Structures are given as C-alpha cells and as structure tokens.
Amino acid sequence: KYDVVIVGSGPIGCTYARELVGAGYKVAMFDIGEIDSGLKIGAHKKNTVEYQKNIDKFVNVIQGQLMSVSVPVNTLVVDTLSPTSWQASTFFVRNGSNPEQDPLRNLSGQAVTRVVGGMSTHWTCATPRFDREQRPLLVKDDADADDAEWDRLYTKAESYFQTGTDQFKESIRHNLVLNKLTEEYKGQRDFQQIPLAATRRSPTFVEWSSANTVFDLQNRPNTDAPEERFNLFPAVACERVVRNALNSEIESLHIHDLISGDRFEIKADVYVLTAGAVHNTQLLVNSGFGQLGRPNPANPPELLPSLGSYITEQSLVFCQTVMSTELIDSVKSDMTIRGTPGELTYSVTYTPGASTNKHPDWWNEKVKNHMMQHQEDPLPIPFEDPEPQVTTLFQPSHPWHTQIHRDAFSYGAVQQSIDSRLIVDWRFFGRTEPKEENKLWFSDKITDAYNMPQPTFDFRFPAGRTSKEAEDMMTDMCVMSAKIGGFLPGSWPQFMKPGLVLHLGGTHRMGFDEKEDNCCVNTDSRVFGFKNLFLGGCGNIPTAYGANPTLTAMSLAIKSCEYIKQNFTPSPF
Amino acid sequence: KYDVVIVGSGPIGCTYARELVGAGYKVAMFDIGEIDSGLKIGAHKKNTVEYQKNIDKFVNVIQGQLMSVSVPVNTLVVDTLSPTSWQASTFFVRNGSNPEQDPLRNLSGQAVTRVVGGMSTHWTCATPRFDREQRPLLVKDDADADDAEWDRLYTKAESYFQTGTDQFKESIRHNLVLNKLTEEYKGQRDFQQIPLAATRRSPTFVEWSSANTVFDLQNRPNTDAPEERFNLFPAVACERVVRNALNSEIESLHIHDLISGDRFEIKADVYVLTAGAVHNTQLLVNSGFGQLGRPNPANPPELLPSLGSYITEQSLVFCQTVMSTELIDSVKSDMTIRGTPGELTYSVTYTPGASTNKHPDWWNEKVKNHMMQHQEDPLPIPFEDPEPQVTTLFQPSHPWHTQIHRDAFSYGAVQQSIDSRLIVDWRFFGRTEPKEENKLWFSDKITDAYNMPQPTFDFRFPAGRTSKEAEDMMTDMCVMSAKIGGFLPGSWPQFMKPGLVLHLGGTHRMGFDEKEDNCCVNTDSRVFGFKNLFLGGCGNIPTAYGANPTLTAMSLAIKSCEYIKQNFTPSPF
Amino acid sequence: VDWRFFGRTEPKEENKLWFSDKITDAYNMPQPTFDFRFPAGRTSKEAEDMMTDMCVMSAKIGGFLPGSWPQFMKPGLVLHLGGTHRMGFDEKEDNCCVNTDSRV
Amino acid sequence: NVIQGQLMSVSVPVNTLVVDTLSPTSWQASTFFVRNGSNPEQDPLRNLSGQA
Ligand SMILES: *Cc1cc2c(cc1C)nc1c(=O)[nH]c(=O)nc-1n2C[C@H](O)[C@H](O)[C@H](O)COP(=O)(O)OP(=O)(O)OC[C@H]1O[C@@H](n2cnc3c(N)ncnc32)[C@H](O)[C@@H]1O
Ligand SMILES: *Cc1cc2c(cc1C)nc1c(=O)[nH]c(=O)nc-1n2C[C@H](O)[C@H](O)[C@H](O)COP(=O)(O)OP(=O)(O)OC[C@H]1O[C@@H](n2cnc3c(N)ncnc32)[C@H](O)[C@@H]1O
C-alpha cells in the first residue's frame, strides 16, 4: 500500500516524484526498464568523460535504446540468393513486423525507450517554452492570467531541469553563427542560444540534465532525506489499472515483476501514469478505456472516446552545412598576418582593445594563439571550441522551431573528410494540426514484445496548413542555412522519417470539457470522471506545437501535483 | 598505501582482484572509465530484458564504447561543395587523425573501451582453450607436465567465468547446424557447442558472464565480506609507474583523478597492469620502458627492448548464410502433413517414439505445435528458438578458430527481408606469426585524447604461412558454409578490417628468457628484472593463436597470482 | 520533375587549362591538366543565391524526391567549358586569342 | 547509358582511397602510385573533375 504510485521513471514521472515525495507522500515508482546509467540513477548517459571526449559515438547509445513502435511487413525482393537456400513463396509476417500496420499510414520513426530515466538518459536537453499559439490553455478568457500561470509553471520546470541560456556564451563557432544570423535577420527575427537543461563544469565538459536532475531516484528514508518515503522498482511491467464500476476511481494497479515472474496488485490513493505517449495509451486500453482493435466509429468507445485520436507528430527537416569562406575569414578579421605559415617570417598579431576591432579581446587572443601555435592548421578556430547552439524560436510569421547546432551524428567516410569545426546541423520542426482521423490503436490479435496489445498507427500529415507550413519550413531552412554555408554532401536538405523526432503528442489529450474539447484529461491532468487517476507527458498536449515538448509537459505535471496536494492527504509516517 | 594496486577493471584485472582480495591482501583498483552497467558493477550490458528481447540493437552498444586506436589522415576528395564553403588546399591533420600513422601499415579496426568491466561488458563470451600449437609453454621439456599445468589453470578460469557447453542444447537451429556438420565431416573434424561464459536462466534468457562474474567489484569490507579489503576508483587515469634506479622495483604509481583534477602517487607492495594490450604498453612507455618515438633499431631501448614488437592480430573472415531447403525440410521430416495450411483439412502429425523417426520427441513436439498453431508461418522452427552456437576447434589440419552462430548484427533493409531463423553467421579466425617488425609504438610529439603518447601501428600480415593459411581459411569457410546454405546477399565472404577482431596480442610478450625468447615478462607474468611488477592480458601471449584469447590470459593471471601469494605477505587487517 | 540551375563564372587569369610536357593522354598527345577554382566574390555568392532560388521555386511545384535533394554537381559535369581560346577586340587589352571573326 | 558511354574524363587525379579488407595474400603497393589512367600533374583540389 502506497499513497502515490507512479508508472514510469522518465522526467515526467520524476516530476511527480519530486513534488510528491517532497510533500511527504509515501511514493512507489515502477519502471519496466532497468538501472543502467551508473550510480546516479536515471542520469544522462552523455555525462561520462569518454562521451564528452567523443560526442559522435553517442548516436550509438541513442540507437541502442530506441525500439521501433510499429514496423510493417517487409516486401523487398532478394533475388540473388543461392538456389539451395530456402525461400517462402510470399512475404509472410516475420522479423517482428506488425501485420496490422499499413506501411503508408505509419509513423515509421516512432520508437520507445525502456530504461530507468526514460528518454532523458539520451535526450538533447533543449527546453524552450511554448508561445501562446502552441500552448494549451490553463485559464479561459483571460490571456494575461493564462500567461501568468504558464510563467510560474515554466519557471519552476526550468529550475528543476537547470535550464540555462549561457553555457555556450564563449564559443567562437556559436557566436560566429549567432552573430551572422542576428545581423542577417535584423528587424525581422530574433536569435538566441537554445535553452538547454545543462550545467557547464569546465571549458570542455557540460553536465547534461536528466530525470536524475529532477529527482535522484534514491530509495527513502535515507540519511539525506530521513523523513521522505520513496521506493523505485525497476524491471516491473505495469499491466492494467482496475476501475471501479462507476468509473470514478482506480482501485489497484496490476504489476508483473519481470525478474521473478510474480504478478501482484498494488494499492494506492493516487495513480499516476507517466509511461510515455504510446505506453500510457496502451495501459489505458488494457484497462478498459477506449477500445481494443481497429477503430470503428460506427460504435465509438463509451469510456474516453477521444483516447488515441487527434495524435500529432512534428515534421522534421534536416541538413548540415560547411561554413562559408566569408565567415571563416571574418574570425580572423582583426589580425595582421605576415609571412607564410610554417616559415621563419610568419606572424599573426592584433591590437587589443582597439575601437575598430570587430571582436572582443577574448576572441582575438584565442584566435591569435591558435594560429601562431598551430601553423599546420589552416583554420582560425581552436580545436576544443564548443559547438553552436542557436535558435530563432517559433513565431506566427515563422511557425516552426529551429535548432542550429551540433548533435551526435554518424558521419560517413566522405563526410569525415570535412573538418568538424566547419560543420553545423540544422533541424527545423513543424507543427501538426490535431485531426480526429489520426489514431494510435492497439491490436486485439497481435501482441508486442512484452505481450501487451500491439500498437498500430493510422497516421497521415494533415492536408492544409500543416502540410503547407512543412514546405514553407523546408524553404526557410534552405534560405537561412545559406547565410552560414553551403550544404554538406550527404546531408542535403531533407525530411526525416515520420516520428523519428520523438515528440508524439495528443494521444491522451487535455482540455476543459471532455466532449466539447474532445479530450481525455482536464487541466489538472486528471482523467475525466476519475477522482484519483492522473496522466503525465506529451500525450496530454492537445495543440499543434513545433517546439520540443518536455518542458511544457513537466509544467503541466507540476500543476497536476498542486491539485494532488490540494486533494489528498499523505499517510502518517 | 595498499598491498596490491591493479590498473584496469576488465576481466583480467578482476582475476587478480578475485585471487588477491580472497587471499587477504589490501587491494586498490583504478580504472580510467566509469561505472555505467547498472548496480552490478562491471556486469554484461546484454543482460537487460530489453537486450534479450532485441539482440541486434546490441551492436549499437558495442560500437558506442569502441574508440579507434589510430586513424590515419583522411584524403578523400569532396568536390560537390558549394563554392561559398571554406575549404583547405591540402588534406591537413584533422578530426582526430594520427599524422604518425601510415594508412597502409595500420590495424584500422583496433579499438579500446574505457568503462568499468572493460570489454567484458560487451564481449561475445566465447572461451575456448588453446591446444598445444597455439599455447605458450609453462613447463619446458615435459609436454605432459605442461598440459597438466594448463588443465589446472584453464579449469579454474572456466569456473571463474562460468564457462559451459550446454546452454544451447535444446535449440532446433543449433542442433540442425551442428548435426549437419558432424555428419558432413564424419571421420575428419569434430564439432561442438562454442564454450560460452554464460548461464541460461530461462528458455529465452541467458545471463552472459563478465568481469562482474569473476569479481563483484564491491568495496570491502562489507557485510558479506567483512574481512576483505578492496576499493575501486573509477575515472582515474594511471599515468606512470616509478622505477627505482636499478630497475628492480616499482616505487609508486602516478594517478590523475579525472573528476577532481587532482594528481597523486599511490604506494603499493605489488603493482599489476591490466589496462589492455595497447594501454599497458602505453603506460610502460610513459614510465621509461622501451622507447618513445618512432622505432630505430640503430639504437634499441635498454629497458625491455622487445616491448611493443612481435605484435599479433588475427585475420578474420565473415559471411552469413540463408539455410538450405534440404535442412529446413529435414526439420519436419518425421511429420505427416495433409491438406493446405489455413484450410479446414490441414493437419501435421508424427508418431512419438517411433524407431524410424530422425528426431527426438522434444524436437517433433515443438515443430508440430508450431506448424499447427502458426499456419500463416511457412517455417517449421519455433519463433523463440535460440540461435546456433557451433564450432570446430583449431587443429593442425585446420589451423583457425570457427564460430558458426549468431551475434548482434546491424541488418540492412534488404537483409531484413530474410527471416531471421534462416540466418547463420560464420566467423573464422586465423593465427598470425609474431614478427619483430610488427610494432606498436608511441609518438613523442602527438598525444591521444587523454594526453598520453599517441599509439601508432607499423603492421602488416606476415608473408609465408600466416598469409597462406588466411586464404586456406577463407576457402574453408566457403566450403563449410555451403553445407548449411547459400550466402546472404550483403554478407558474402569477406575479410574484415585488420584489428576489428580485438584479439591483439604479443605487445608485452611472455617467455622464459628475456633475450633468447625476445620477451618482456616471464611465466609468472613478472616483468624481467622487477620484483614487484606484473602485466596481465592478451599482450602476454607470445604465440600465433586463432582462438579467442581471454580464457588463456585469465589462466596466465591465475598463475601470476599464485606467484604473488608465494612471495608477498598481506598486511595485518 | 528535374531542376537544373546553371550559374555564371567570372573569367579569371588564374583559372587555367594547361598541358603536361611529360605525361601524355590516351592518344599520346600532351595531357590536359586543370588549375581551377570557382572565383571568390560575385560568382560564388551568386552560386549560393541560385541554390536558394532553386529551393524556393521548386517548392511551388512539390517536395524533393529522396535521393535527389538539392545539391551541387561535380565541377565540369555540366560540359559548358568556355574561355579556353577566348574572343575579344584587342589581343592585349581584352586578353584574348581570337578576334570577332574567330580569327586567331 | 549512351551519354556516359561516350564521355571520357579529361583529368583524373591519383586515387588515394585505402582498401584494407583485402586478403593477406593479395599483392599491394606501399604507396598510392600513379595508376589506372590517373594524371599525376593534377591537384585533386584544383580540378574540373566532371569535365569530359
Ligand atoms: C530519444 C530522444 C528524445 C528527445 C531528444 C533526443 C532524442 C534522441 N531531444 C529532446 C530535446 O532536445 N528536448 C525535449 O524536450 N525532448 C527531447 N526528447 C524527448 C524527451 O526525451 C521525452 O519527451 C521525455 O523523456 C518524455 O518523458 P516521459 O517521462 O513522459 O517518458 P519517457 O522518458 O519515455 O519515460 C517513460 C518510461 O515509462 C516506462 N514504461 C513504459 N511502459 C511501462 C509499463 N507498462 N510499465 C512500467 N513502466 C513503463 C519506460 O521504461 C520509460 O522509462
Ligand atoms: C569488444 C569485444 C571484445 C571481445 C568480443 C567481442 C567484442 C565485440 N568477443 C570475445 C569473445 O567472444 N571471447 C574472448 O575471449 N574475447 C572477446 N572479446 C575480447 C575481450 O573482451 C578482451 O580480450 C578482454 O576484455 C580483455 O581483458 P583485459 O582485462 O585485459 O582488458 P580490457 O577489458 O580492455 O579492460 C582494460 C581496462 O583498463 C582500462 N584502462 C585503460 N587504460 C588505463 C589507464 N591508463 N589507467 C587506468 N585504467 C585504464 C580501461 O578503461 C579498461 O576498462
């Protein structure tokens, strides 16, 4: 018996834990995944010296914990086999494919992570706020009151994640890119550093935030928190919540310990589901919400008929660029260079503090010393200079999120020929209109690897504004990126596979009125009709958004926990 | 001050810890890497439910912790850049390349892992013994005595790693492949299961051994070992051992804590280096053994002139096959099949226990039930049937090691069209003659990512028998694999990049006499001349070997620890 | 639909086609060798403006075909090499090889 | 195919790509020598590589 049980140990489940453990509730948390980020439980995997030394190897870490949600049956012909090799006469269901999945209505890049800390053990840590256009309402008919509520929630979410905009302020590359863009879009768009959930520890080490930053996941009471109560139970599959008859309360949570094989029911006052946008939906379906099997509006579900409908995923366009000659030469614009590099006469000098210099002294010292000490190196940028982290945030005249940066990436052998200091990544994210016909549903015949109902998508990007804006966004990336450099071969402007972005929203969406707003939870993230059932995560977000959603989802989790504190009493310790 | 200090927390360093902590020595162990395998410190990363469900994702784990030792300067031309993009006029030293490295004398696949548990957190766990031809001598001029010593050491090493040959005995695929090969090579070669360091826990879960199996790496004393003494210090770079003047003793170990930045000297009675074949050599060079800079026999080193010479790496050939029609049909040879699958009349039956059946009842029940219950599936092999794990061990008439199995592999989209149950991997490993001219040396100008002397190879596969045998081995794989099926397109028989095998040996090689056997350590793994310095690992192996070397290296570590117990007294507790 | 946009290249003295005095081609004639880079300044800026223009214009018709994303082609693949024996009015003042009758 | 079959490259630089998955029995040079019709006068970084 617990006061509060939380399904899922990602950053949203950890927000509930931080708030509710700190308030004195006796809290249990279950995760189907295991502890495997080191002794700091749920911490960011990128915070080892070895990954900080070799960022690009990190793409392997990410890929190794992303499992595809729904893979269609493969129909590719292989006809260069030996005649002795056994072959079927049809393209049969094999290799883990979902036979319910129409390949032409899929989110083929959608994937899930089952580990303690969830996806926050590998995420990019970008934590922008949503502007009004992207953001669900918390106060109706009073925009100033609505803004005030969001500001308070986002401010607390930013403190939990240690969001900052200063960790890259003395990078030459960052400031090179940022300066050019600020100048090019003067009077039209504003640029800043991407808000990142991270703390710089040294000039070459950044401690990336994670679920662990929000809540350390250590069992309590302990010497450090002797009056708190928390237990974490990894390798436990939460299967089903038991509804009462009137669908007004949850009575227990059915769990399956994957190590012992034992199956139990756990009792709690408050049940919080934070298993992610796919797996929250799965657990609800398995508990008798919505409908199992292929959707059939002939007869909509009685319980939460909007569950799994109005799903949204962002469009994502990508390229990389190789920095222009104009910009590289500008790095060293304040220098007087004489002689020929490597020969007796070579020198590089500048006049500190001169009013006509284009750069600050900190920049010019770094450049000068790099050029003088490394004459074998033809670039003016220090070897260990951090990467750009630049954005122009979503606005009505440019309704997409932008990241102009470097993230872990697997470079091919041709691309490895280009010096890394030249390369900048461009990721532009579009907003997707929520449409009733875009669904996540669960098979009544096929099961997934954990023997739960197999998720299946029926998705297409909506016609109309979403689609038009996706193309305007592609064009905008092409236009903007040209100010910095030309494209890197092999990383020409392209759309990525749908869902590869991992910002799936709207699967258990929020609104004011269940019927009128076609939604599953109210603004306290409480499931309609249920006194003690709360859902957290991006699945709650009912709007068309382009920015990265986790901070927003954390903010809605905070509000949800304020409701729980107003309505449920902790047990005596 | 410690009785014993161990540099490196892989399985060889853990062998020293297990032996010496258990004998009552006060032991410290340092690893440059971090704890990141979960709460069981140094455990196998593949032992999560999630990897057991999705083996192929594990290749990402491996790749994410393999860092290339020496990468030459890239000279590939990219000429489809935009004219605005900055480009150098030469192929300059960039992107981490080693300018000392001749691309045509490299081991381009050689890589290192810096993590607590070392490479044993991702290894394949194959632990064969070496036969006399491959194995260094421990007793001169008495082959029976020599065999007896190796048998005792291997038996203890097998118990430490939990080596077994029974974990795949009821797999249909394993027995299908094994049976065919046993029959095809009757009277010529013997086949068995690959000896694997692993314990089966259920029909779908195998607990793969690791450094943690050998020693749990927990600090001691603790409730469970209240009279033992052990401390593990991760994120500590060991830089140098301090020699006395006479080169008869080590006086201290210089360390650098990578988190605090502090640099200390640690005192011990016994110093053991188990940092791997590359990094042991690096640490010795940094400590004044051998020679820094490009080798120059004009003046050989005074101290350990054979260090870093006579290096050996195995040749490795690879393919995959798609199982033959003959073999797939043989699975169901005992069945009477009537009707058409999916139709009312379909049935599959057999006669249990009949003397004319080709398979045991356990096999036929599995097949029959699979065929009847899954009529949409055209194959007779159960979905969760384990993979083959088959070998014919090195012999003078086939002087290569063989693994005929499945390991984690990244399948392309065409290859994903072939049902996984059809696919078998073939890895054949050749032996490489030790030659003086094959060297690992360390730059006196360029440093690696941890600011230690940059490793550089001067390697080519020797002419003569090694090379001839590499081709005979390629032919043998082609011949043998054809008995099982034809090649899988994209996985046609091929040599892999040199060093990708990761069985680098001979860098600090063992023998009886330093001069006459051109070696660095004696048969107690004691560095010649030094009373208290021991090296462990594959670097000790002085022979041409084809089998996987870790069990052999563990065996030599055991012998080394028996010497330490005979010669050094533990401190009072 | 295919989109091919072709830019103009400023003639620069330093961009040369020359012929080896040591190496011969397949017909045993002096081997052609280039010393070429796209000029700095307007040519190069316009090449990027042109890339942008193709991206903008093409979006009015449809999205890109995977595998045929906007890209520069290898230099010279266009086969519109000019200026190797160039025309002008005055040999010296116009740095040229033939007059307006194409007479050397 | 018709086009490609009658376009002959004007000036091809010396190839320096490393192939290191050959068999140990196969003959290999220790340098990237002038071969396969390459023009040793041609700096790969000042070429018109598509000219034909
Ligand atoms: C993968 C990734 C994600 C990502 C990112 C880059 C990549 C490569 N970049 C981001 C960024 O720059 N900014 C941002 O806002 N988000 C970014 N993301 C996405 C972000 O990681 C996710 O939005 C976030 O982690 C979602 O948090 P939430 O806590 O809701 O969910 P989760 O992390 O997926 O964790 C859920 C857990 O629940 C478990 N689980 C699942 N099913 C069950 C059942 N049945 N029973 C018990 N536990 C369950 C999982 O194992 C998991 O840990
Ligand atoms: C990677 C791998 C290896 C492998 C394998 C498959 C792959 C993909 N398959 C194997 C198999 O089937 N059978 C077998 O016998 N071996 C197989 N291997 C190789 C095996 O993992 C290695 O032979 C073995 O792990 C070697 O053990 P050893 O203990 O000698 O070395 P290590 O595991 O590399 O660990 C050494 C550690 O030392 C640290 N270190 C390095 N430098 C320093 C310094 N300067 N200071 C402090 N510590 C240092 C490392 O961080 C490391 O953990």
In a 3-state reduction of DSSP, which class is residue C45?
Answer: helix
Cα–Cα nearest to B94, from A222, C49, A419 = A419
* Ligand that comes closest to the CA of residue A235: 1
Q: Name the residue in chain A with its Cα closest to that of C40.
A: A325
Name the one residue in this structure whose structure tokens are 């220090």.
A382
Q: Residue D4 is encoded by which pair of tokens? A: 């490609």
Give dist(CA C3, CA C53) in Å, integer.
11
| CB atoms inside a 10 Å sphere around CB B515 | 10
Q: β-strands A250-257, A236-243: how paired? A: antiparallel
CB contacts under 8 A, B 479-498 vs A, are 482, 485-489
Give dist(CA A548, CA A403) in Å, integer.
10
In a 3-state reduction of DSSP, which class is residue B416?
Answer: helix
Give dist(CA C20, CA C29) in Å, integer.
9
Using an 8 Å Cβ cutoff, are A467 and A430 in contact?
Answer: no
Using an 8 Å Cβ cutoff, are A197 and A208 in contact?
Answer: yes
Name the one residue in this structure whose structure tokens are 């392997």.
A60
Q: Residue B428 is encoded by which pair of tokens? A: 């054949």
Q: How many residues does chain C have?
A: 104
**Residues of chain B positioned with their CB less than 8 A from the CB of D22:** 495
Q: Residue B380 is encoded by which pair of tokens? A: 């007779």
Give dist(CA B150, CA B163) in Å, integer.
16
Residues B315 and B328 in one domain: no
Using an 8 Å Cβ cutoff, are B488 and B477 in contact?
Answer: no
Give dist(CA A480, CA A500) in Å, integer.
23
Are A321 and B485 in contact (CB < 8 Å)? no
Are C55 and A479 in contact (CB < 8 Å)? yes
> Is-cis flag, bond preceding B462, omega within 30?
no
Give dist(CA B400, CA B429) in Å, integer.
5
Output the CA torsion A498→A499→A500→A505 (10° steps): 150
A125 is in an annotated binding site: yes
Q: Residue B560 is encoded by which pair of tokens? A: 């080394």
Give dist(CA A308, CA A295) in Å, integer.
10
CA atoms within 13 A on the CB side of A508: 30
Cα–Cα nearest to B282, from B507, B20, B530, B116 = B507
End-to-end CA distance of chain D: 15
Give dist(CA B104, CA A144) in Å, integer.
69
Cα–Cα nearest to C19, from A122, A19, D10 = D10
Using an 8 Å Cβ cutoff, are A510 and A525 in contact?
Answer: yes
Name the DSSP class of B497: P
Amino acid at B559: K
Q: Which contiguous run of DSSP H or E holds residue A221?
A: strand A220-222
**Which residues, other chains included, contact A149 with Cβ-Cβ below 8 Å and sequence gap of 6+?**
A138, A139, A559
Give dist(CA B366, CA B382) in Å, integer.
7
| CB atoms inside a 10 Å sphere around CB B573 | 9
Q: How many helices (H) and strands (E) does chain B have?
A: 11, 25
As a three-state string, the secondary structure of A254-302 is EEEECCCCCEEEECEEEEEECCCHHHHHHHHHHCCCCCCCCCCCCCCCC
- Which of B365, B385, B405 terminates a domain? The answer is B385
Residue nearest to atom 17 of ligand 2 (CA): B123
Residues B335 and B278 in one domain: no
Give dist(CA B475, CA D23) in Å, integer.
11
Residue nearest to atom 36 of ligand 1 (CA): A275
A466 is in an annotated binding site: no
Give dist(CA B209, CA B383) in Å, integer.
25
**Which residues, other chains included, contact B85 with Cβ-Cβ below 8 Å and sequence gap of 6+?**
A321, A322, A323, A324, A325, A422, A485, A486
Residues B503, B508, B532, B540: which is the catalytic one? Answer: B503
Using an 8 Å Cβ cutoff, are B310 and B438 in contact?
Answer: yes
**Which residues, other chains included, contact A334 with Cβ-Cβ below 8 Å and sequence gap of 6+?**
A350, A351, A354, A357, A358, A359, A364
Give dist(CA A217, CA A121) in Å, integer.
13
Residue nearest to atom 50 of ligand 2 (CA): B114
Cα–Cα nearest to B102, from D20, A160, A442 = D20
Cα–Cα nearest to B321, from B433, B206, B400, B420 = B420
Using an 8 Å Cβ cutoff, are B290 and B280 in contact?
Answer: no
Residues A260 and A343 in one domain: no
Q: Name the residue in chain C with its Cα closest to that of D13.
A: C33
What secondary structure does DSSP assign to A386-430, as a single string? PPPEEE---BTTB-EEEEEE-------TTGGGS-GGGEEEEEEEE
**Which residues, other chains included, contact B188 with Cβ-Cβ below 8 Å and sequence gap of 6+?**
none
Q: Give me the number of domains chain A comprises.
A: 2
Using an 8 Å Cβ cutoff, are B474 and D27 in contact?
Answer: no
CA A297, chain centre distance (Å): 32
Give dist(CA D52, CA D41) in Å, integer.
17
Output the CA torsion C57→C59→C63→C66 (10° steps): 40
For testing the chain D interface, which of B68, B71, B79, B431 should be mutated: the one with the most D CBs within 10 Å? Answer: B79
- Which of A385, A419, A437 terminates a domain? The answer is A385
Give dist(CA B488, CA B324) in Å, integer.
11
Cα–Cα nearest to B237, from B63, B447, B62 = B447
Our answer on whether the CB atom of B448 is closer than 6 Å to any ligand 2 atom is no
Pocket test residue of A60, A123, A282 for ligand 1, highest count of atoms within 8 A of CB: A123
**Residues of chain A positioned with their CB less than 8 A from the CB of B34:** 38, 48-50
Using an 8 Å Cβ cutoff, are B14 and B215 in contact?
Answer: yes
> How far C93 CA sits from the closest chain A CA (Å)?
32
Residues B50 and B166 in one domain: yes
Alpha helices in B211-356 (DSSP H): 211-214, 277-286, 325-331
Instruction: Judge residue A293's burial from the number of C-beta atoms within 10 Å of its C-beta, 0-12 exposed, 13-18 middle, 19 or more buried.
Output: middle
Give dist(CA C39, CA A350) in Å, integer.
28
Residue B548 falls in the annotated catalytic set: yes
Q: Which contiguous run of DSSP H or E holds residue B178?
A: helix B172-184
Q: Which contiguous run of DSSP H or E holds residue A370?
A: helix A361-373
Q: Residue A182 is encoded by which pair of tokens? A: 């600020």
Residues A219 and A344 in one domain: no
Q: Tell me the longest C-alpha to C-alpha distance in chain D.
A: 39
In a 3-state reduction of DSSP, which class is residue A382?
Answer: coil
**Which residues, other chains included, contact B450 with Cβ-Cβ below 8 Å and sequence gap of 6+?**
A53, B32, B237
Give dist(CA B482, CA B478) in Å, integer.
6
Our answer on whether the CB atom of B237 is closer than 6 Å to any ligand 2 atom is yes
**Which residues, other chains included, contact A225 with Cβ-Cβ below 8 Å and sequence gap of 6+?**
A21, A218
Give dist(CA A153, CA A155) in Å, integer.
5
Give dist(CA B335, CA B564) in Å, integer.
62
Cα–Cα nearest to A67, from B58, B45, B406 = B58
Going from the C-alpha of A497 to that of each of A316, A500, A502, the distances in angstroms are: 8, 6, 11
Q: Residue A377 is encoded by which pair of tokens? A: 């190196």
Going from the C-alpha of B533 to that of each of A352, A478, B134, B277, B515, the distances in angstroms are: 54, 61, 26, 16, 19
B538 is in an annotated binding site: no
Output the CA torsion B240→B245→B247→B248 (10° steps): -110
Residue A85's DSSP bridge partners are B324
Give dist(CA B50, CA A450) in Å, integer.
10
Q: Could you give phi then psi for residue C58, rounded to 5 degrees?
A: -70, -25
Q: Residue A420 is encoded by which pair of tokens? A: 């890394």
Residues A342 and A477 in one domain: no
What secondary structure does DSSP assign to chain D, as a single string? -HHHHT---S--PPP------S-TTS---SS--S-TT--TT--GGG--TT--
Q: β-strands A196-202, A205-208: how paired? A: antiparallel
Give dist(CA A511, CA A520) in Å, integer.
7
Residues A256, A279, A370, A503: which is the catalytic one? Answer: A503
| CB atoms inside a 10 Å sphere around CB B554 | 25
> How far C95 CA sits from the closest chain D CA (Å)?
22
As a three-state string, the secondary structure of B503-545 is CCECCCCECCCCCCCCCCECCCCEECCCCCEEECCHHHCCCCC
Q: β-strands A26-30, A225-233: how paired? A: parallel
Please, what sign has the CA dihedral across residues A458, A464, A465, A470? Answer: positive
**Which residues, other chains included, contact A238 with Cβ-Cβ below 8 Å and sequence gap of 6+?**
A7, A30, A32, A253, A254, A255, A275, A283
Name the DSSP class of B193: E
Give dist(CA A497, CA A103) in Å, integer.
12
Residues A359 and A508 in one domain: no
Q: Tell me the longest C-alpha to C-alpha distance in chain B.
A: 89
Q: What is the C-alpha radius of gyration for chain C, rounded to an integer number of angstroms? A: 18
Residue B526's DSSP bridge partners are B534
Give dist(CA B61, CA A58) in Å, integer.
10
CA B158, chain centre distance (Å): 15
Residues B14 and B78 in one domain: yes
Q: Residue B233 is encoded by which pair of tokens? A: 């210090």
Q: Which contiguous run of DSSP H or E holds residue A148?
A: helix A143-161
Cα–Cα nearest to B292, from B100, B26, B127 = B100
Pocket test residue of B14, B69, B113, B119 for ligand 2, highest count of atoms within 8 A of CB: B119
Alpha helices in C28-97 (DSSP H): 42-58
Return the exposure string of A379-393: e unless at least 16 CB atoms fall within 10 Å of the residue's CB, then b. bbbbeebbbbbbbbb
Sheet holding B250-257, edge to edge: B236-243, B250-257, B263-266
Q: Which contiguous run of DSSP H or E holds residue B18?
A: helix B11-22
As a three-state string, the secondary structure of B113-177 is CCCCCHHHHCCCCECCCCCHHHCCCCCCCCHHHHHHHHHHHHHHHHHHHCEECCCCCCCHHHHHH
Residue A256 falls in the annotated catalytic set: no
Q: Residue B477 is encoded by which pair of tokens? A: 């794989």
Name the DSSP class of A103: G
Q: How many residues does chain D have?
A: 52
| CB atoms inside a 10 Å sphere around CB B215 | 26
> Could you tell me the residue range of the domain that residue A492 belongs to?
1-323+386-573
Name the one residue in this structure whose structure tokens are 């094989």.
A261
Q: Residue A424 is encoded by which pair of tokens? A: 């900048």
Give dist(CA A217, CA B393) in Å, integer.
48
Give dist(CA B307, CA B288) in Å, integer.
11
Give dist(CA A332, CA A393) in Å, integer.
30
Q: Could you tell me the resolution of this structure in angstroms?
A: 1.9
Using an 8 Å Cβ cutoff, are B256 and B239 in contact?
Answer: yes
Using an 8 Å Cβ cutoff, are B23 and B29 in contact?
Answer: no
> What determination technique applies here?
X-ray
B449 touches chain A (CB under 8 A): yes
Residues A376 and A492 in one domain: no
**Which residues, other chains included, contact B322 with Cβ-Cβ below 8 Å and sequence gap of 6+?**
A81, A82, A85, A86, A87, B418, B422, B423, B485, B486, B487, B488
Cα–Cα nearest to B263, from B39, B30, B72, B435 = B30
Instruction: Judge residue A374's burial from the number of C-beta atoms within 10 Å of its C-beta, 0-12 exposed, 13-18 middle, 19 or more buried.
Output: middle
Residue C19's DSSP bridge partners are C32
Name the DSSP class of B179: H
Q: Could you give phi then psi for residue A540, rounded to 5 degrees?
A: -75, -25
In a 3-state reduction of DSSP, which class is residue A442?
Answer: strand
Please, what sign has the CA dihedral across residues B556, B557, B562, B563? Answer: positive
CA of residue B53 to ligand 1 center, whole Å: 19
Residues A210 and A346 in one domain: no
Nearest to B496 among D18, D21, D24 (CB): D21
Q: Could you give phi then psi for residue B331, rounded to 5 degrees?
A: -55, -40
In a 3-state reduction of DSSP, which class is residue B368?
Answer: helix
Q: Give residues (CB < 6 A) around ligand 1.
A: A 7-13, 30-33, 62, 113-115, 118-120, 122-127, 237-238, 274-276, 279, 283, 502, 537-538, 548-550
Q: Residue B261 is encoded by which pair of tokens? A: 């930045």
What secondary structure does DSSP assign to A27-62, as a single string? EEEE-SS---S-SSTT--TT-SHHHHH-GGGHHHHH
Residues B396 and B337 in one domain: no
Q: Could you give phi then psi for residue A62, rounded to 5 degrees?
A: -55, -55
In a 3-state reduction of DSSP, which class is residue A156?
Answer: helix
B102 is in an annotated binding site: no
Q: Residue B399 is encoded by which pair of tokens? A: 């002087």
Cα–Cα nearest to B217, from B202, B201, B233, B200 = B233
> Is-cis flag, bond preceding A570, omega within 30?
no
- CB-defined contacts A:C, below 8 A: 44
Task: For residue A239, give the ligand 1 atom closest to its CA.
Answer: 45
Using an 8 Å Cβ cutoff, are B483 and B495 in contact?
Answer: no
Residues A441 and A483 in one domain: yes
Give dist(CA A243, CA A255) in Å, integer.
15
Give me the helix-helix angle, A550-567 and A143-161, nearest 10°.
100
Give dist(CA B464, CA A115) in Å, integer.
51
A327 touches chain B (CB under 8 A): yes
The CATH number covering residue B378 comes to 3.30.1920.50
In a 3-state reduction of DSSP, which class is residue A215?
Answer: coil
Name the one residue in this structure whose structure tokens are 């890895």.
B427
Amino acid at B426: W
Q: Residue A456 is encoded by which pair of tokens? A: 């299946």
